[PDB]
Design a protein around this ligand. Structure first.
Ligand SMILES: [Cl-]
Ligand code: NA
Ligand code: NA
Ligand SMILES: [Zn+2]
Length: 317
């Protein structure tokens, strides 16, 4: 026997701004009508419409020409599963806590998220503007204290699920790919006693990141690196134009001196079985570990990333 058809009006979206009116049959699941569907992060694909859902907004995958354009303009991605990864992470990050620690939005530990807490604290201390409007909107909310959307977007952009381990340097590199760093320029010189000098110019993300030493002062004086001839070449910073620099190295015992750096990330333990902490240099040295806070006049620990302020630098060598 035919059951009389019942419908409700709902809206679908890929960006929570542009809405698309839909009339849904309450005898069929959201999945049968829209494909994978989410209500504020919760997966409702296998759910049949409820009367209470009338007029609500549901996220869907951008599986039509209009949604494809709206999703590209908002997120700067055409990765087919992006929206699903974003919603899946959001269902968890909306339950995390974001305490204000020393005036910054932190994240209380959950789901192995210490790498995200130190990335978030770091972003609030360096001059950086995101390109996708999704990151601009969510980062503004994160700075105000509501970082759930921003954290779920970091996870989606980095291809990490909630609970999955992450590397801070890798996470910052992904975020920098979605930032406006076109005014950043680095000029390096590599000198070999045999092979001579070779100058290189780096732009954008490559102009603000360096892997090999934590010391910006030592990078300016010269660092010893291998040469193709077998000898050691000296690489030094000739020119730098950027509002910050990020120096990274495999974690090792290192002394952080108050007033000589902006902030840093510490990794205690072996690779894939450790924990990150954040050190910020303000009136004194503050150590932020998610919701936890301690202070000290000096600091020594296994540091893996250090951030420094910059504007314009030219060598004397
Ligand atoms: Cl921004
Ligand atoms: Na997830
Ligand atoms: Na972590
Ligand atoms: Zn050489």
């Amino acid at each position: 026997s035919h059951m009389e058809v019942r419908t409700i009006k709902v809206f679908t979206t890929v960006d929570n701004i542009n809405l698309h009116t839909q009339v849904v049959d309450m005898s069929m699941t959201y999945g049968q009508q829209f494909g994978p569907t989410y209500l504020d992060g919760a997966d409702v694909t296998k759910i049949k419409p409820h009367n209470s859902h009338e007029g609500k907004t549901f996220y869907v995958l951008p599986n039509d020409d209009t949604l494809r354009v709206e999703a590209f303009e908002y997120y700067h991605t055409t990765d087919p599963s992006f929206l699903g990864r974003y919603m899946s992470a959001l269902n968890h990050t909306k339950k995390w806590k974001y305490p204000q620690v020393n005036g910054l939005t932190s994240i209380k530990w959950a789901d192995n998220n210490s790498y995200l807490a130190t990335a978030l604290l770091t972003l609030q201390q360096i001059e950086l503007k995101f390109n996708p409007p999704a990151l601009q909107d969510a980062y503004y909310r994160a700075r105000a204290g509501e970082a759930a959307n921003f954290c779920a977007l970091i996870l989606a952009y980095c291809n990490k699920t909630v609970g999955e381990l992450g590397d801070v340097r890798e996470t910052m590199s992904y975020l920098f790919q979605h930032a406006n760093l076109d005014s950043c320029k680095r000029v390096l010189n590599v000198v070999c006693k045999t092979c001579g000098q070779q100058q290189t110019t780096l732009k954008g993300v490559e102009a603000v990141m360096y892997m090999g030493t934590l010391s910006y002062e030592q990078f300016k004086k010269g660092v010893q690196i291998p040469c193709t001839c077998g000898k050691q070449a000296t690489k030094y910073l000739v020119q730098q134009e950027s509002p910050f620099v990020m120096m990274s190295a495999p974690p090792a015992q290192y002394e952080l001196k108050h007033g000589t750096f902006t902030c840093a990330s510490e990794y205690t333990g072996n690779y894939q079985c450790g924990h990150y902490k954040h050190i910020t240099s303000k009136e004194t040295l503050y150590c932020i570990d998610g919701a936890l806070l301690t202070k000290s006049s000096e600091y020594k620990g296994p540091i893996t990333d250090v951030f420094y302020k910059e504007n314009s630098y030219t060598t004397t060598i």
